C-alpha cells in the first residue's frame, strides 16, 4: 500500500521495488548481448522493425565512450546517452590527470557509484539502464563487466539482456571463443541471432556488431559491413 | 502501530518502533550468503563462501574478499551493491589516518568512525539506509588479532569471534560452547573450527574453490589470502 | 608612532594586599590636547578594571565589545567577572583579525573574587597575554617607567606607601618629559573600600 | 629567545630562556615558552608568542580530537604531519621557529619547526636568536646517548651556552624532564643573572603630594 | 641540495647530499632528500623544504589511496603525472624540484625529471642542484649507456663529490639510494 | 512530498491557526504564574511542575530565570524550548547595552522575542515555541511595566496575567483586589500569599516548590531581591495571620 | 512547500503534548538500566551492561565514556545517534575551554548541549535523541550531577535512576540513599540499586562503576568492579 512511493524507503518483504521495476524494464527493449574472445571483447545490438521505421544505422545503442572501451546499452536510449557522457567525462578525468588507458576495473566502478547512488534517492529515480563493459589492452588483456540497475558491479565471460530469447548466447558454447582470433567470431554469433526472436512478434529485425580487441590495437569501432563482409555473409547461410 | 504516511518515509512510528530499519533485517536474504569469524591468540581467520550458478563466473570479479589496507582486510554481506559503496568509505577514512596520523589506523575504534558516516546514511532525510554489513579484521601492537563486525544501523560493534546475518545466528551457538569452557587457539585450530561451527548451520561440504576463507596471523603483519592451494590441504586436516 | 598618535600611558602597580593602576586624563591628537576630562580605565564587573593605552577608538571599542562579552558570561553563570576570564575574553577578541589586529595597550588589574589576592597582566595589541609578578607599565616612553619603577616598587607595600611611591614617580616624569600631562588618575583598590584619586599634573 | 634540546635513550631532556625582549628593553623576564601540547608531548616557543600560542592551542585542541580518537595514549607521528599539512596550507604567512619533542612507543624523537612547515626529524635541534651558541656545544659534542643523566647535563651545557654567549637569552635557565613513564618539568633551574641591589631607598613618604579629587567607594 | 639519478637495465640508482645551508649558516648538517611514495617509487627533492614535502605527501594520499584501490603494481609513469600536473597549476607559486625515478614492472626502471616548469620528460640520466654548474661538464662525459647498478654507485659517488667539494651549499655525508626488483637499498659513505 | 507536509504553517478551514490553536493548550497546563501592580517594586511568583522533592534544587532560580542582572523573566512552559529564546533574548538585550550603553526597555524587548517565535510560525514550517514568559523591568520614560508572549508571536503584555491554569478563585479576587500599587513591599507580597495558599492544589502553601523574586527600583543599581526561602516562610505565616484576621470579620 | 530539506517534523497533538519526542522515552523505558548518585565529596556512577552472548567482552566496548578528564557521564536507553552528540560535545567544550581558560563546569555542559538537542529536536527529517544523559563531574569545589532528557529538560537529582523500571528504583534510591554519603557508601547503594532489575548473575563484566573524584573523574577498571562487587554492595 504505497510501499513503492519512496525510492528511499524498503519493502514489506525486504527489497526495493524500484529496482525491482526497473530490472524489468530493461528487459522490454531490444536484446543487447555482448562476449569476451581472448585477445578483444565483442558486442552486439539488435534494431527493431515496426513500419519502416527510419534510416537504417540510426540512434544505434552502440556507443564509444573511450579509445579501448565501448559501450553495448538497453532500455530506455535517452537515460543510456546521458550515462554515456558521463563515461566520457570521467574518461576525459582519466586521460587528463594520469594520461593513459583507464582500466576497465574501476571504470565500472565508478559507474558503479552512479547507477548506485540515483537508486538510493526518492528525489532522483533508479536507471532503466543495463549494459554492457568490455575492453582489451596489451597490458591488460580481456575483459567484461555485467552492469545491473541495482548498481552491483561484477562480469561474466558473457551476458545477455533485452529481449528474453536467451538462444543466441546459446551455441557460442558449441563453438571455439576463448581459442578464436575474435575475428572469425563475428560471423559465428550472429547465426541463431537470425533464427531465434522470431517474426510472429516482429517481422523485421536488424542487427549491429561491434569489436575491440588486439587486432584493432586496443581500438574500438563498429565492424563495417563491407569490410571484411563475412559477419552478414555467413549468417545468412548458417540459418539451418 | 501505523498512523497516515509514515509507512512511505522512513521516521519513527507511534508506537515508537521502526519499520524501513527493521525491513533491512531480510535485505541479507536476497544476497543469501554467510559470513563467519573467529579470532585466535595471534591469529583471526574469516569464513566466506560464493555461488556459481553459471559456469560462466569469474573467480576474481565476483571474489568477495574485500582488502582495505595491506595490515587490514574486510568482508560484507547481503546486497553486493550497497557493499561497494562502502567499500571506498572504509578505505577513505582509512587513507586519511594514514596520511594524518600515520600509525596502524584505529584496530579498535575504527567502527565509530565508519558507522558515523553509516549513520549519516540513515539519518539522512530520505536516502537508502543500505543494510549492507561491514566486518573488519585488526592488527595492533603486542595487543594481538582484532576482529569487528559493524551492521548498518550506525553503531560500532566488534569482539572476538562475532556471526550476524542470514544463517549466522546458528554459528555463534557453537562458538559460546567451543571458545569457553576454557581453551586456547592455534593458526589452524581457527581454520579447523572455522568450517565446525558452519557445520551445524550447513556446510553442504564440496570443491574449497568455492568458499573463500580470510585469514590473518602475526609474523609479517600484512593481510594477505593465499589462491586455492593449502585452504583445501587445511580442509582435509580438520577431517581425519 | 600609532601608539604615540594618542599618547597615553597605563601603569598598574600591585602593593601587598592591594592593587592600584594609574592612567594620564590626556586626550588629543599628536601634540594638540583637545580635552582632559576623557574617562581612559573603565569600570569592569567588580573591583575590577582595565587600562587602556593606544588609539581612542580601540579603547573606547574593546571597552564597549568586551562589556558585551562581559554580561554574556555572568548571566549564564552567576559566579564572578575572574581577572583570568577576562583576560583571554579581550585576548581572544584581540586575535578576531590575525593581520589587521586593533592596536592598544590593555592592562588589566583586578582583585580575585574569591579572595583578597590581587592580580595583574598585561596583553600585546595582538592578544599575546602576559603577566608580571611586580607591576605591569605601558605607555610611550618606557625609559621612564620601567627606569623608576625598578629603584622605587618593594615587595610589600600597603596602600599608604603604595599610592605615593607612584605619585611621585607621576610628577617628576610629566614636570620633565613632554608627551603625557594633563593630569593623570589613579585607582587603588582594595578587598574593604575602592579608592579613586588624581593626581595634580602640568596644565601646559 | 633560544631554544634546544638533545635526545637520549629512553626519553628527552628540553629547555629554554625565560627572558623575553620586545625591543631594546626587556619586556618579560621570567617567561615559559615550553607549552602542553599533550601529556607525553612538549614543544618550546619562539618568534611570535600570540601566534604559536593560538596555534598551539588549535593545535593540541585538534589534537584532543586525533589522539583521543583511538584513545591509548599520544604519538608524535600523530602531531609531526599535521604541522606540515597545516602549517604549509597557510603557506608560511604565520611563524612558529619551534622544538617538537615527544616520548612514543617506537621510543623518543626530536623535531625542528619552521615557519614554512618544513620539519626534519634531529636527535638535537636549535632555533631562536641564540641557535648559533646552542648548536656548536650540540653539533661537535654529540654522542649516542647512552645512559639518561649524561644527556640531561648535555642540554643544561648548551642553554647555558646561549645564555652566556648570546646576549638575547638571560634570566633563568629551563629544563623539562620527558621520558615514556616519568615526566619532570623543572621550572627557573637555575638564575645565572643577578640584579644590582638598591644604592638606597628611593620611598617617596606622604605629605608632598597633592591629590586633586579622591573618592571612597566602600564594598561588601 | 645537490640531487642525482641514474637508471640502469633492472632500475634506478638515486643520490642526495646530506648537509643544507641556508644562507651561510648551515640548517641541518645530515638530511635525506630521498622520499618513501612507495617501495617502487622514489623521488628527489631540492630547494625549499617545505614545498616538497607536501606535494610528496599529497602524492602519497592521492595515490595511496587509488593505489591501494587499484590492488595493482605502483605504476611510476601515472605517479609521475599527478606531479606533472600540480606543478604545472602552482607554478607560479610553488616550487618544483622533484625528479622521479623508481623501477616499476611493466616499463622497468625508468627516470622522470620534472623542473620548475612542470614538465615531464624522460632521459638516461638526471641532474639537479644549486652545485650541479661545475659538473656540468663532468657529467656529459664521464656517463656512460648501459650502466650497471654496481658502477652506477661509483659514478654517482663521483659526481657528488665534485659538486659537494666545490660548491659551498652542498656537502656532509655522501648518501647513495640503490633501486631494483629486489627492493630498496640504502648507504652511507664518505670520503 | 506534498501529502507528507502536514501544513503545520499554513491555517486551518476554521479561521484558526490549526498549529497555534493545539499550541496554546500546553500553555494553560504545565507552567503558572501571576503579576500585579506594586510600587517602587515589581513582585513575581510561580510553581513548579517539577515540584517534587527529589530533586536537588541547586539551579537557584530555575522557573524565575533571570535573564539580566537587572531584568527576570517567569517562564511558563518547556526548559529547553524557552532556553533558546533565554540567550537569544539575552544577546538581543546585550547587543543593544553594546551600540548603546543605556538598559534596554520593556517596549521593544517583547516585540523582538515575538517576532522570533512568530518567524516559525509564518514560514518554514518548523515547531513554533509553546513558551509563554512575563516580563519585568523599569525604564526612564513609562516606569513600571508587564507584559506576556503569546506562541502565535503576539505580545499578550497587560498590566495584569493569569497562567497558566490554576489560581482561578484568586483571578477573579484580583479584579476584587485591582486597586493599583502599594508598599510596604511585604504588603503586596501579603497578597500574593493568600492566591498561592487558597488556590493551590495540595494547598499548604509549600515553600520548597514555589520561589518569589523582587525587583525593587534602586538608583541606580536597581537591585533585584531574590528571597533565599528563609524570609518566605514569614511571609508565608505573615498574611496567613492576615487571611487568618481576614475571617474574624465574618 | 519549501525545498524539502527536512522542515520540522514535530507537530502539537490536540492536548499540547510532542509527538515523537514522548516516544523517544519509549526507548528510553525499553533501554538498559543506569543510575548515578550525587553525594558529599562526589558523585558515584553505577551503569548495566550485559552481554546478549557468550561472545561478546566487555573489555572492548566500554558504556563510560567521559568528556572530559573531570567530567563523567552515562546513557540510557538507545549509540548510533548518541556517539554524534558525544563528539559535538567535544567539539563544543573547547570554546569554553579556549576562550575562558578553564574546566568547563557540567552545568555549562547542560545549558549548551541541551540547548543544541532541544535544537536537533526541533529540526524535523531526523529522529529525535532517544538518549537521556546523566551529566556529572566535579567545579568550583562543589561537583554535580544532572540529567537530561530526550525533550531536553535538564533536571538535578541526588541519586537517580533510568531505563527499565526507573520509577520503582527511584523510590530505593529515594529511601536506602539520603542527604550524603561517602563514596564508597555511594557505590555501595548504586549497585543495589542496580542490582535490583539486574540478572541472577553479576560479575565485574556485568556492571560497571564510574566515581567523579573532586580531584577529577576516574574511570575504575573492572578490576576494582569485581572487588567492591561480588557479593554485589
Given at each position: ?240 | ?240 | 608612532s600609532i601608539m604615540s598618535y594618542n599618547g597615553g600611558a597605563v601603569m598598574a602597580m600591585k602593593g601587598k594586599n592591594c592593587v592600584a593602576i594609574a592612567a594620564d586624563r590626556r586626550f588629543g591628537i599628536?601634540?594638540?590636547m583637545v580635552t582632559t576630562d576623557f574617562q581612559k580605565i573603565f569600570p569592569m564587573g567588580d573591583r575590577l578594571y582595565i587600562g587602556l593605552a593606544g588609539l581612542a577608538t580601540d579603547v573606547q571599542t574593546v571597552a564597549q565589545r568586551l562589556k558585551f562579552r562581559l554580561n554574556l558570561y555572568e548571566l549564564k553563570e552567576g559566579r564572578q567577572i575572574k581577572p583570568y576570564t577576562l583576560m583571554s575574553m579581550v585576548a581572544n577578541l584581540l586575535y578576531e583579525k590575525?593581520?589587521?589586529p586593533y592596536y592598544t595597550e590593555p592592562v588589566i588589574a583586578g582583585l580575585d573574587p574569591k579572595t583578597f589576592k590581587p592580580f595583574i597582566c598585561s596583553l600585546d595589541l595582538i592578544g599575546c597575554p602576559m603577566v608580571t609578578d611586580d607591576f605591569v607599565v605601558s605607555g610611550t616612553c618606557a625609559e621612564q617607567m620601567y627606569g623608576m619603577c625598578e629603584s622605587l616598587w618593594e615587595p610589600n607595600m600597603d596602600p599608604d606607601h603604595l599610592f605615593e611611591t607612584i605619585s611621585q614617580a607621576m610628577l617628576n616624569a610629566v614636570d620633565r618629559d613632554a608627551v603625557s600631562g594633563m593630569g593623570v588618575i589613579v585607582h587603588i583598590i582594595e578587598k574593604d573600600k575602592i579608592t579613586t584619586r588624581t593626581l595634580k599634573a602640568r596644565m601646559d | ?16 630562556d625565560t627572558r623575553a625582549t620586545e625591543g631594546?628593553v626587556v619586556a618579560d623576564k621570567n617567561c615559559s615558552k615550553i607549552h602542553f ?8 616557543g619562539?618568534?611570535?608568542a600570540a601566534?604559536?600560542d593560538m596555534?598551539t592551542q ?112 638571560g634570566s633563568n635557565?629551563d ?10 618539568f623543572l621550572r627557573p633551574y637555575t638564575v645565572?643573572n643577578k640584579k644590582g641591589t638598591r644604592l638606597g631607598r628611593y620611598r617617596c613618604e606622604k605629605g608632598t603630594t597633592a591629590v586633586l579629587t579622591e573618592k571612597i567607594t566602600p564594598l561588601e | ?191 | ?32 504564574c501571576?503579576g500585579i501592580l506594586a510600587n517602587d517594586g515589581v513582585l513575581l511568583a510561580a510553581?513548579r511542575?517539577n515540584?517534587?522533592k527529589?530533586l536537588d534544587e541547586v539551579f537557584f532560580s530555575e522557573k524565575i530565570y533571570k535573564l539580566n542582572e537587572d531584568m527576570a523573566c517567569s517562564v511558563?512552559?518547556?526548559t529547553?524550548?524557552a532556553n533558546?529564546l533565554t540567550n537569544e533574548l539575552r544577546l538581543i538585550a546585550q547587543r543593544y547595552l553594546l551600540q548603546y550603553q543605556e538598559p534596554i526597555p520593556c517596549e521593544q524587548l ?23 514568559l512575563l516580563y519585568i523591568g523599569w525604564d526612564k520614560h513609562y516606569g513600571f511595566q508587564l507584559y ?33 500599587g502599594e508598599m510596604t513591599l511585604k504588603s503586596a507580597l501579603a497578597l500574593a500569599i493568600?492566591?498561592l ?8 502553601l509549600s515553600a520548597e516548590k514555589v520561589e518569589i523574586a523582587t525587583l525593587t527600583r534602586e538608583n541606580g543599581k536597581t537591585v533585584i531581591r531574590v528571597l533565599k526561602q528563609k524570609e518566605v516562610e514569614q511571609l508565608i505565616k505573615k498574611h ?11 | ?37 550525587k553525594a558529599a565529596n562526589g558523585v ?23 568528556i572530559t578528564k573531570h567530567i ?20 563544543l567544550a573547547q570554546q569554553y575551554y579556549l576562550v575562558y581558560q578553564e574546566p568547563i563546569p557540567t552545568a555549562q555542559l547542560v545549558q549548551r548541549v541541551a540547548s ?19 551529566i556529572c563531574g566535579w567545579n568550583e569545589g562543589r561537583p554535580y550531577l544532572f ?7 535538564y533536571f538535578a537529582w541526588k ?20 542527604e550524603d554519603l561517602e563514596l ?28 567523579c573524584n573532586e580531584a577529577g573523574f ?16
Open positions: 500500500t504505497g510501499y513503492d512511493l519512496s525510492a528511499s524507503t524498503f519493502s514489506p518483504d525486504g527489497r526495493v521495488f524500484q529496482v525491482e521495476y526497473a530490472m524489468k524494464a530493461v528487459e522490454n527493449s531490444s536484446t543487447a548481448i555482448g562476449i569476451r574472445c581472448k585477445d578483444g571483447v565483442v558486442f552486439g545490438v539488435e534494431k527493431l522493425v515496426l513500419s519502416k521505421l527510419y534510416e537504417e544505422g540510426s540512434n544505434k545503442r552502440l556507443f564509444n565512450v573511450d579509445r579501448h572501451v565501448g559501450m553495448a546499452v538497453a532500455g530506455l536510449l535517452a537515460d543510456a546517452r546521458s550515462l554515456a557522457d558521463i563515461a566520457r567525462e570521467e574518461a576525459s578525468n582519466f586521460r587528463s590527470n594520469f594520461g593513459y588507458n583507464i582500466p576497465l576495473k574501476h571504470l565500472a566502478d565508478r559507474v558503479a557509484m552512479y547507477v548506485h547512488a540515483y537508486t538510493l534517492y526518492s528525489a532522483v529515480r533508479p536507471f532503466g539502464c543495463s549494459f554492457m563493459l568490455g575492453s582489451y589492452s596489451v597490458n591488460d588483456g580481456a575483459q567484461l563487466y555485467m552492469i545491473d540497475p541495482s548498481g552491483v558491479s561484477y562480469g561474466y565471460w558473457g551476458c545477455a539482456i533485452g529481449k528474453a530469447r536467451q538462444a543466441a548466447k546459446t551455441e557460442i558454447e558449441k563453438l571455439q571463443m576463448k581459442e578464436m582470433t575474435c575475428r572469425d567470431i563475428v560471423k559465428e554469433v550472429a547465426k541463431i541471432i537470425y533464427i531465434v526472436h522470431d517474426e510472429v512478434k516482429d517481422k523485421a529485425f536488424e542487427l549491429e556488431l561491434s569489436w575491440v580487441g588486439e587486432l584493432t590495437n586496443g581500438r574500438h569501432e563498429i565492424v563495417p559491413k563491407d569490410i571484411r563482409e563475412e559477419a552478414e555473409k555467413y549468417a545468412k547461410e548458417s540459418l539451418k | 502501530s501505523s498512523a497516515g504516511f509514515d509507512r512511505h518515509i522512513t521516521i519513527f512510528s507511534p508506537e515508537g518502533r521502526l519499520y524501513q530499519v527493521e525491513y533491512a533485517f531480510k535485505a541479507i536474504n536476497q544476497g543469501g550468503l554467510t559470513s563467519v569469524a573467529v579470532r585466535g591468540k595471534d591469529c583471526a581467520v574469516i569464513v566466506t563462501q560464493k555461488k556459481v550458478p553459471d559456469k560462466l563466473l569469474d573467480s576474481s570479479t565476483v571474489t568477495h574478499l574485500f582488502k582495505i589496507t595491506e595490515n587490514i582486510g574486510c568482508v560484507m554481506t547481503g546486497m553486493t551493491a550497497d557493499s561497494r559503496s562502502q567499500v571506498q568509505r572504509a578505505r577513505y577514512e582509512a587513507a586519511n589516518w594514514k596520511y594524518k596520523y600515520g600509525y596502524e589506523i584505529p584496530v579498535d575504534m575504527l567502527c565509530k568512525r565508519i558507522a558515523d558516516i553509516s549513520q549519516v546514511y540513515t539519518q539522512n532525510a530520505e536516502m537508502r539506509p543500505l543494510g549492507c554489513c561491514m566486518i573488519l579484521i585488526g592488527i595492533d601492537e603486542e595487543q594481538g588479532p582484532q576482529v569487528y563486525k559493524c551492521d548498518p544501523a550506525g553503531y560500532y560493534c566488534g569482539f572476538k569471534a562475532t556471526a550476524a546475518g542470514v544463517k549466522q545466528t546458528e554459528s555463534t551457538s557453537f562458538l559460546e560452547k567451543k571458545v569457553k569452557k576454557k581453551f586456547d587457539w592455534t593458526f589452524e585450530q581457527t581454520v579447523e573450527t572455522a568450517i565446525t561451527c558452519l557445520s551445524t548451520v550447513l556446510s553442504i561440504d564440496f570443491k574449497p574453490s568455492e568458499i573463500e576463507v580470510g585469514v590473518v596471523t602475526v609474523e609479517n603483519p600484512k593481510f594477505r589470502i593465499l589462491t586455492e592451494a593449502e585452504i583445501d590441504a587445511h580442509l582435509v586436516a580438520l577431517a581425519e | 599628536q601634540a594638540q590575525r593581520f589587521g | 629567545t633560544t631554544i634546544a634540546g638533545v635526545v637520549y635513550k629512553d626519553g628527552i631532556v628540553l629547555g629554554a631594546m601540547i599533550s601529556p607525553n608531548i612538549y614543544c618550546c619562539a618568534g611570535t601566534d604559536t596555534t588549535l593545535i593540541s585542541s585538534n589534537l584532543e580530537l586525533h589522539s583521543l580518537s583511538t584513545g591509548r595514549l599520544p604519538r608524535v607521528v600523530t602531531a609531526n604531519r599535521m604541522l606540515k599539512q597545516m602549517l604549509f596550507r597557510y603557506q608560511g604567512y604565520i611563524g612558529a621557529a619551534l622544538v617538537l619533542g615527544g616520548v612514543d612507543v617506537t621510543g623518543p624523537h626530536l623535531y625542528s619547526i619552521y615557519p614554512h612547515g618544513s620539519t626534519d626529524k634531529l636527535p638535537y635541534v636549535t632555533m631562536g636568536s641564540g641557535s648559533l651558541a646552542a648548536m656548536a656545544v650540540f653539533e661537535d659534542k654529540f654522542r649516542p646517548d647512552m645512559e639518561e643523566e649524561e644527556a640531561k647535563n648535555l642540554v643544561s651545557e648548551a642553554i647555558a651556552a646561549g645564555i652566556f654567549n648570546d646576549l638575547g637569552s635557565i629544563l623539562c624532564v620527558i621520558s615514556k613513564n616519568k615526566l619532570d645565572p | 641540495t645537490t640531487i642525482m639519478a641514474v637508471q640502469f637495465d633492472g632500475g634506478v640508482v638515486l643520490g642526495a647530499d646530506s648537509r643544507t645551508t641556508t644562507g651561510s649558516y648551515i640548517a641541518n648538517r645530515v638530511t635525506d632528500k630521498l622520499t618513501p611514495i612507495h617501495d617502487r617509487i622514489f623521488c628527489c627533492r631540492s630547494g625549499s623544504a617545505a614545498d616538497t614535502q607536501a606535494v610528496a605527501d599529497a602524492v602519497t594520499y592521492q595515490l595511496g589511496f587509488h593505489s591501494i584501490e587499484l590492488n595493482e603494481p605502483p605504476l611510476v609513469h601515472t605517479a609521475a603525472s599527478l606531479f606533472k600536473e600540480m606543478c604545472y597549476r602552482y607554478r607560479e607559486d610553488l616550487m618544483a624540484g622533484i625528479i622521479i625515478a623508481g623501477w616499476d614492472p611493466q616499463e622497468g626502471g625508468q627516470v622522470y625529471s620534472v623542473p620548475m616548469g612542470g614538465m615531464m620528460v624522460r632521459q638516461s640520466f638526471a641532474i639537479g642542484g644549486s652545485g650541479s654548474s661545475y659538473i656540468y661538464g663532468y657529467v656529459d662525459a664521464t656517463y656512460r649507456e648501459g650502466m650497471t647498478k654496481e658502477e652506477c654507485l661509483q659514478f654517482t659517488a663521483n659526481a657528488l663529490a665534485l659538486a659537494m667539494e666545490r660548491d659551498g651549499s652542498s656537502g656532509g655525508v655522501i648518501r647513495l639510494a640503490a633501486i631494483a626488483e629486489s627492493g630498496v637499498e640504502r648507504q652511507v659513505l664518505l670520503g | 512530498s506534498r501529502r507528507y507536509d502536514s501544513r503545520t504553517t499554513i491555517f486551518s478551514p476554521e479561521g484558526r491557526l490549526y498549529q497555534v490553536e493545539y499550541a496554546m493548550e500546553a500553555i494553560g497546563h504545565a507552567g503558572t501571576l510553581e511542575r515540584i517534587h527529589l511558563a512552559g518547556i529547553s524550548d533558546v517583547v516585540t523582538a522575542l515575538c517576532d522570533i517565535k512568530q518567524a516559525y510560525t509564518q514560514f518554514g514550517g518548523k515547531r513554533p515555541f509553546g513558551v509563554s506576556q508572549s503569546d506562541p502565535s508571536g503576539n505580545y499578550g503584555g497587560w498590566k495584569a496575567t493569569c497562567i497558566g491554569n490554576n489560581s482561578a478563585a484568586a483571578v477573579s479576587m484580583l479584579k476584587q483586589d485591582y486597586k493599583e493568600k492566591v495558599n487558597k488556590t493551590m492544589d495540595v494547598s499548604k496567613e495571620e492576615e487571611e487568618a484576621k481576614a475571617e474574624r470579620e465574618k | 512547500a519549501e525545498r524539502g530539506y527536512s522542515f520540522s517534523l514535530t507537530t502539537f497533538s490536540p492536548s499540547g503534548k510532542l509527538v515523537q519526542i514522548e516516544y523517544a522515552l519509549a526507548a528510553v523505558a525499553g533501554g538498559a538500566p543506569s543510575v548515578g548518585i558515584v556512577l553505577a551503569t548495566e551492561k550485559k552481554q546478549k552472548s557468550i561472545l561478546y567482552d566487555e573489555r572492548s566496548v566500554h558504556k563510560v565514556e567521559p563523567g557521564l552515562v546513557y540510557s536507553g538507545m549509540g548510533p545517534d548518541y556517539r554524534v552528540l558525544v563528539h559535538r560535545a567535544r567539539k543544541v538537542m532541544q535544537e536537533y529536536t526541533q529540526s524535523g527529517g531526523v529522529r529525535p535523541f532517544g538518549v537521556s544523559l546523566l540529567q537530561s532528557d530526550p525533550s531536553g529538560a541519586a537517580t535512576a533510568m531505563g527499565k523500571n526507573y520509577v520503582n528504583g527511584k523510590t530505593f534510591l529515594e529511601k536506602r540513599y539520603n564508597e557508601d555511594a557505590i555501595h547503594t548504586a549497585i543495589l540499586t542496580l542490582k535490583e532489575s539486574f540478572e541472577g548473575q553479576m560479575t565485574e563484566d556485568n556492571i560497571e562503576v564510574g566515581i576516574r574511570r575504575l577498571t573492572p578490576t576494582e568492579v569485581k572487588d567492591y562487587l561480588a557479593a554485589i554492595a
